[PDB]
Amino acid sequence: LFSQIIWFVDDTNVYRVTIHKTFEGNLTTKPINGAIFIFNPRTGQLFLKIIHTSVWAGQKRLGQLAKWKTAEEVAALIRSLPVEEQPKQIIVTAKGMLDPLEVHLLDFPNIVIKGSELQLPFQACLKVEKFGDLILKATEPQMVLFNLYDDWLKTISSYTAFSRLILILRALHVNNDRAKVILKPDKTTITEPHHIWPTLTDEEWIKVEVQLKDLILAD
């Protein structure tokens, strides 16, 4: 990493449901909007493709079809980008993405697809209000761009920013409430409206990153 355009593709949050036990004692499973996360670990760029429930229609095995929908949308993004902006590698942390991507990317022989055992839980972003509300309230599919490193790269490397982001996502994933307290060390800690994460000093980030790591380890 950090040298070729690389994308991580996360399909975990594409097919989402609300499960409810009815008064008659049966489970209903009704889909809610999802999203694909496509992330550039060098620059911080996120493409968030929101997936509206209408795409599901009446079909079954939606969990399996989600992998295919994900690969379709990745290919569609690639086709909309000039060649020099297309990724050289796509990395997936879910093994079920590998074959659908292979089949969808046959026209892009330069693109290397590979699996990974890394823990990069973009589902934690559903717990960040910015992303959660945007996904919840969409009435149609759309793509939205974000910079998940805020202004960090002005003073730290991509490697350092990636490590910070991963710790934030994993901490949020394993213990949202405690993660959120660690990320607000002071009464006056704020997040800029165009930022994702709080504005913190270098020393505060040092203490935060140790605490996040300890929170992950405890769980």
Q: What CATH number is associated with residue 213?
A: 1.20.80.40
Chain-centroid distance, C-alpha 140: 19
Contacts of 144 (CB under 8 A, 6+ apart): 47, 48, 50, 134
Q: At what angle do helices 158-174 and 202-218 cross, to 10 degrees?
A: 40
Amino acid at 139: T
Kindly report the number of other CB atoms within 10 A of residue 173's CB atom.
20
Q: What is the C-alpha separation between 40 and 4, in angstroms, rounded?
A: 10
Same domain? 5 vs 107: yes
My answer on whether 142 and 157 are in the same domain is no
**How far is 5 from 90, CA to CA, in rounded Å?**
9
Domain of residue 127, residue span: 1-150
Q: Are residues 11 and 70 in the same domain?
A: yes
The experimental method behind these coordinates is X-ray
- Beta strand 6-10 with 16-21 is unpaired
What's 99's domain CATH number? 3.30.420.230
Read off the tokens for 146: 């974000």
Same domain, 215 and 155: yes
User: 95 and 181, same structural domain?
Assistant: no
Q: Do 5 and 111 fall within a single domain?
A: yes
Cβ contacts of 127 within 8 Å, gap of 6 or more: 172, 176
Name the residue among 87, 67, 59 with its Cα closest to residue 13.
67
Last residue of a domain, one of 111, 130, 150: 150
Resolution expressed in Å: 1.8
Q: Which of 33, 73, 71 is nearest to 52 (CA)?
A: 33
Helix (H) or strand (E) holding 17: strand 16-21
CA atoms within 13 A on the CB side of 56: 19
One DSSP character per residue, 186-210 reads STT----TT-SS----HHHHHHHHH
Q: Are residues 10 and 71 both part of a single domain?
A: yes
Domain boundary among 97, 123, 150: 150
Sign of CA dihedral 124, 125, 130, 136: negative
Same domain, 162 and 102: no
Query: Where among 150, 165, 191 does a domain terminate?
Result: 150
Number of domains within the chain: 2
Query: Is residue 176 domain-shared with residue 209, that is, in the same domain?
Result: yes
Q: What CA–CA distance (Å, rounded) separates 142 from 146? A: 13
Any idea which residue has 């290397």 for tokens? 112
Q: How many helices (H) and strands (E) does the chain have?
A: 6, 8
Q: Are residues 29 and 129 in the same domain?
A: yes
Same domain, 141 and 80: yes
For every residue of 53-114, DSSP letters joined together read GGGTTT-S-HHHHHHHHHHHHHHHHHHHS-GGGS-SEEEESSGGGHHHHHHHTTT-TT-EEE
**Does the CA dihedral 214-182-155-2 come out positive or negative?**
positive
One domain, residues 193 and 105: no
Find tokens 């309230």 and name the residue: 137
